[PDB]
Amino acid sequence: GLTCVTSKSIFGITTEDCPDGQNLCFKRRHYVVPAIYDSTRGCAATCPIPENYDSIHCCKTDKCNE
């Protein structure tokens, strides 16, 4: 199925063959402190709605959420 990054960091890269009915990848950008942003990634059925002043990018190709 669609492949997405479910984790990316100084400890490496996790990639998942997405559960059926999840044909979207997402990458959330979250401000923790002034110059520091936590990124979160995964597969989803629908694009998650951003909160906390976050921004979220959603896309539909393999590992598009790098």
From Swiss-Prot:
Keyword Secreted: yes
Protein origin, superkingdom: Eukaryota
GO cellular component, one term: extracellular region
Compartments where found: Secreted
Transmembrane feature ranges: none
Gene Ontology MF terms: toxin activity
Phenotype upon changing Y53R: In AncTx1; 2-4-fold increase in inhibition potency on ADRA1A and ADRA1D adrenergic receptors and 17-20-fold decrease in inhibition potency on ADRA1B and ADRA2C adrenergic receptors
Disulphide-bridged cysteine pairs: C4-C25, C18-C43, C47-C58, C59-C64
Reported tissue expression: Expressed by the venom gland.
Effect of R29W: In AncTx1; 2-4-fold increase in inhibition potency on ADRA1A and ADRA1D adrenergic receptors and 17-20-fold decrease in inhibition potency on ADRA1B and ADRA2C adrenergic receptors
Keyword list, A-Z: Disulfide bond, G-protein coupled receptor impairing toxin, Pharmaceutical, Secreted, Toxin
Broad class of where this protein is predominantly found: secreted
Effect in UniProt of substituting K60G: In AncTx1; 2-4-fold increase in inhibition potency on ADRA1A and ADRA1D adrenergic receptors and 17-20-fold decrease in inhibition potency on ADRA1B and ADRA2C adrenergic receptors
One Pfam family, short name: Toxin_cobra-type
Family membership noted in the UniProt record: Belongs to the three-finger toxin family. Short-chain subfamily. Aminergic toxin sub-subfamily.
Other remarks in the entry: Negative results: does not show interaction with adrenergic receptors (ADRA2A, ADRA2B, ADRA2C, ADRB1, ADRB2), dopaminergic receptors (DRD1, DRD2, DRD3, DRD4, DRD5), histaminic receptors (HRH1, HRH3, HRH4), muscarinic receptors (CHRM1, CHRM2, CHRM3, CHRM4, CHRM5), and serotoninergic receptors (HTR1A, HTR2A, HTR2B, HTR2C, HTR5A, HTR6, HTR7).
Function description: Orthosteric antagonist of the alpha-1A adrenergic receptor (ADRA1A) with an affinity of 0.35 nM. Also has affinity for ADRA1B > ADRA2C > ADRA1D. Acts as a relaxant of smooth muscle. Reduces prostatic muscle tone as efficiently as tamsulosin (an antagonist presently used), but with fewer cardiovascular side effects.
UniProt name for this protein: Toxin AdTx1
Organism listed in the record: Dendroaspis angusticeps (Eastern green mamba)
